[PDB]
Amino acid sequence: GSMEEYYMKLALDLAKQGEGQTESNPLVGAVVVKDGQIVGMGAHLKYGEAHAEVHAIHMAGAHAEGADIYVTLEPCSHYGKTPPCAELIINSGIKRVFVAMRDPNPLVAGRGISMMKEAGIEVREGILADQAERLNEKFLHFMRTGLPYVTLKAAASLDGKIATSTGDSKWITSEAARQDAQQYRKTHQSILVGVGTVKADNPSLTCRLPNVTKQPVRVILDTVLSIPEDAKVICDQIAPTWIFTTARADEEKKKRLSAFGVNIFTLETERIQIPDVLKILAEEGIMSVYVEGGSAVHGSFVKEGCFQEIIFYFAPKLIGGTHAPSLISGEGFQSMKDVPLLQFTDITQIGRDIKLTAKPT
């Protein structure tokens, strides 16, 4: 093993400790070494609070002076919700710093390294950038593309059906699978679904796990605003509800809905385009979207190539039926030469079910 590597490693593991506590902020670890001895360690633990460097340097005490510091992400240079870390590093008299990777965030891009270099501080980057990458996939993708990180999820029988030819779907996959699916209602800032789902299952789309601290944004794709006005996603006040329609939506009805706190987004088109929906979500602050329902909705996402992750749960059952609804509705790909290739990322059993996850290639 290496020594500069052991330190960046410790920083990555320190980073993991904030997983799911930092909301929109990324996971970050910081470890200060002075005279070959660890004197400070830190991690971003809570959104809106001290960053990793702040904790590490404050712990470092007076050994901060002339010491080294390893950060999994480049020290921020902006005056946002927290003061600049780059500034804290230079004002604490840190000799040299090691950054695993640059913060793609528009208002920090490379700016944090320049701010420390011009102050004489030696900056080195690259150490374990691969794992630093695996640490904040969503945040990163969002900062680099401007579009939310999209995950598509569906449950189905082993022969690919999502219900019988009569629409029965009461028990396709076990409770263990459903419970596993709930994790995603936490790693994602929003749950996305078509109104067909609301009309059919009148879901709560809210997370029913333990660490309830910030319900996810519930997005509804409703082309002609036919959503039932009595629906949970409208009269439960449990979480933010955003609906996307077109000019074909009824003005009066549209006024009644916002009266309940629902935020409507009227698209200047005839058929809700997925790409416009994503861009708008990104612009409102949504960094991740968990697309749960609408085989047609999944179809639009798959056809336009707007997904980073695909997650299917297969049950050891066979539904059959020529007219039984399949996993992906909509247009579809004409011939094989046009169908995109994906790669399986994880195959794991959950109860009696199988969970296959794949990603674009």
Place this chain on the structure above:
Amino acid sequence: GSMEEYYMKLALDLAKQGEGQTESNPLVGAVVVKDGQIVGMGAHLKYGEAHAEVHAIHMAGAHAEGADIYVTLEPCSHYGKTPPCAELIINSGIKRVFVAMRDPNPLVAGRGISMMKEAGIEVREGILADQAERLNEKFLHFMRTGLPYVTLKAAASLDGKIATSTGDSKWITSEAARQDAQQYRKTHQSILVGVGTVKADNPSLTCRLPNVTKQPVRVILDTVLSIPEDAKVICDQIAPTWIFTTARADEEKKKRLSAFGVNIFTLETERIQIPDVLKILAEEGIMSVYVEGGSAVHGSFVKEGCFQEIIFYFAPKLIGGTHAPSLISGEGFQSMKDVPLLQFTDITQIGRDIKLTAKPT
């Protein structure tokens, strides 16, 4: 551990040396031990020829006197193509017999143990029973139930499509996967497909893997003989071809295909009944069937509940589209409370694709 278990293990390993050589006969092994030494070893190597016991007892010679013998399957007691092995055992002076499991057929079951018990021989049962069962899974099924061991095989995209909405399916699963499937055209006595597949692809349905001892019987399902005599099995019958048709199956055709070697069967009904087909083959000495033909065919087998194994190859590809052929078509179950629950027995990544195999409860 146990020495008894070692001998039975050895017998089991000897039995396998005849795989794919014993035809309809089950694999069987035997080892004779005298005064703690191995003096005889044997297995069934050729159909219609000596059984394991005949080989082992011969090799043992005078050592068979007062010795023990371990056999994987109950020693025959009838008069097929070899005199009763129980008699051979009795007259060799063998004192004790270790039997893994009894004979499948309900009429000849235990008749062997009884004879030997009558002659004063000690018969022990159960040692490595489970492994003996796996060695002749299909055979044991045939005898025990009176019907073929059915295996349904299919390959589809991750979203369960057998082809694009425009019939294209030229590239779904990897060649490595297509290759892994060939191992089934070797372990099954028959391969079954529907005429739909015949005219759509014009398959050979022949085992290409290195072993070429005999040709899996090519069973085709037709209803009116729309099968293009212009190709496939018809032309150059590399192996036996059997077609199941219905009364209204023309006349000049029915007696025209018999002109080659095609054995045409004709069902009474107007609707080809699966349970009738499996019974017909069971009569024809076919002990196992490998079904890969059309989604409809699989649908029938599934609705009828006539299958012991399901093997699905999933490619990391999303074909999508409504009207894109799915894995199983036809009737299917309308109520989710009527969908039979199966169990996954093996997950295996093959090339880029995933191989799922489930068996019924």
Place this chain on the structure above:
Amino acid sequence: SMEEYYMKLALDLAKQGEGQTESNPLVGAVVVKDGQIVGMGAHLKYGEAHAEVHAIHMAGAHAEGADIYVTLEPCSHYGKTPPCAELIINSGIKRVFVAMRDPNPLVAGRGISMMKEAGIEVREGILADQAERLNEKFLHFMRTGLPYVTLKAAASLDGKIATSTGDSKWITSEAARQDAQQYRKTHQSILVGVGTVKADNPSLTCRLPNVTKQPVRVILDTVLSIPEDAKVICDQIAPTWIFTTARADEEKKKRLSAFGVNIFTLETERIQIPDVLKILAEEGIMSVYVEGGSAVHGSFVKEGCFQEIIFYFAPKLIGGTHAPSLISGEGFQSMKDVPLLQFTDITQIGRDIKLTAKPTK
């Protein structure tokens, strides 16, 4: 179990302070609030903030109502600053998880009761074994009052530490000697009899990639016949302490003191191991890595003063009736008087085999 997850994190945090705490034990601490990790800490510098202090300070306001996991009983005495148990009480923490109690019989349980008395819930035992391993040597020193002793020896497969001519330069491999180097990092002192210094003139220094400190080199030299030009007396690389008796020459002791050598004069005719151990403890040496000295080893064994024994065997055979064996000296008279040890580990390093054993109770 989240309990174990948090203690494990506290344990891993404690490790970061290895070799940086002098006589202070390694300790980790993590503060959890509403299911979230809000504070982390470990003792990193001798004479500086304890783990509980870093963790609690990081937790900030979140400490109120929070949970804290600590690998060792929080101190409870009143020195320059408030004890850690008092800190916890003040911060508003409602539950404490302690892996193990203070080793000092006079303090054990003191911090616990101090915290319960303030209405705080205290749970003990979580990962005690690991918390025990973390400070093994420290714990032993604190419990018995003597240093933790490891005896190490390299020898041919037949028990010889050199040929009959004294030739021993490399019986074991480079890899094996490099491995043994590790114990020079984990012990505060390395010990040998003068014989080793006369025969091999070793430096007895720790030459690992990272060495912020050198272990005290202790020499047992009855008559003070050590060569004044030996490395241990001239390299100035590490402290060198010698134990002699009254037979030692005063002017020589003066010459050696001028070189920085620490000489202890025992009031006995022979050097007693129990006395040197006692004097080393009085000087603060909690661990001793004993190598050179078949006679030295013999004394440590006959007196029963070792906690662990490590033998490196080489795939070699050196004969010799006069070749030196592993443990010279008196030895046990009868096989019923020989204490039974227990193999703790068996590993192969390069072409050699490393065996470690510890006595039994």
Place this chain on the structure above:
Amino acid sequence: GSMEEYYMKLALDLAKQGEGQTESNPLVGAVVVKDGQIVGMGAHLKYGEAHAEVHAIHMAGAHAEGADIYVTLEPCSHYGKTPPCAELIINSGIKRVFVAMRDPNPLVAGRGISMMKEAGIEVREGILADQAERLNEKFLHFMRTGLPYVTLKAAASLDGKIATSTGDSKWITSEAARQDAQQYRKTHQSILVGVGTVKADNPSLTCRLPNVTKQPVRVILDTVLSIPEDAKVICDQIAPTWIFTTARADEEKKKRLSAFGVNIFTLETERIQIPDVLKILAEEGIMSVYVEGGSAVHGSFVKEGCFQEIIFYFAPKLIGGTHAPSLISGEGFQSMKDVPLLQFTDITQIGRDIKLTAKPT
């Protein structure tokens, strides 16, 4: 991964089944393959009985005509206890022959391969020669060197003492490891010790494992024939007892013992030389010798380099004692550069003891 070597692996496995029934004869296996099918199998199961090729060809019946045969050893062409199998192969109609390795008996070797080739049989050879070599390690050694295959076994403390300075040896290693030691008194044709080991233990050197059959030859090294007139070996009558002595052997006493069944070999040297006794022993048919003698005896064997294998049993104990006897005494090597390098073969714990086995390189 080829069928070519699968068949040979099989033959090897078949041959393994006669282990410890072969006696002097080597374990051999044969597989007859006709038109891609295993039609016959065999192995040498009993001494003086049929060779592998016999059983296999018989079982192959008429399928032997124009078939192949894989043998783990060159088919014998001489008339020993049974006729020539090479003759058999030919007269059977078999055309190809795969031999794994040629015969060791120089005069009796080569012929087989030649005898066959002379009949038009294509003889390929070398397949799995590696495995075939370990199968009969001792046998091949004896035939290739004319010397017995030697094994040195010893049981000592972890510090290399085989007794206390009092001579007390009342069990260093556990009974479990003592029983593990018995296995060798079953696989070696003779067990050897020095007279010292007799007039200080009066062992019987007899075997005590189920199915004892023949009892190994007991060889004693007695320089002056001072062996006690009454000793379990002299008068037990359990097993043969050979003694090697010199000129200084009392003629009277020599005669007495000869009347008791003891065969005496007098050497014309002043001291007994291992190479001479190993030469005599081979001449008398002894192919292997288990040496547990004494440290002096082991020293002689090591010094001469007269051993193929060394097995040491170490107990989790420290005996100590500068005068306690060591593992290998005698002259031994003066310089580490002179010391021969061995290689660790196997490391296995037996109860609380450790069993090390090594071989010269």
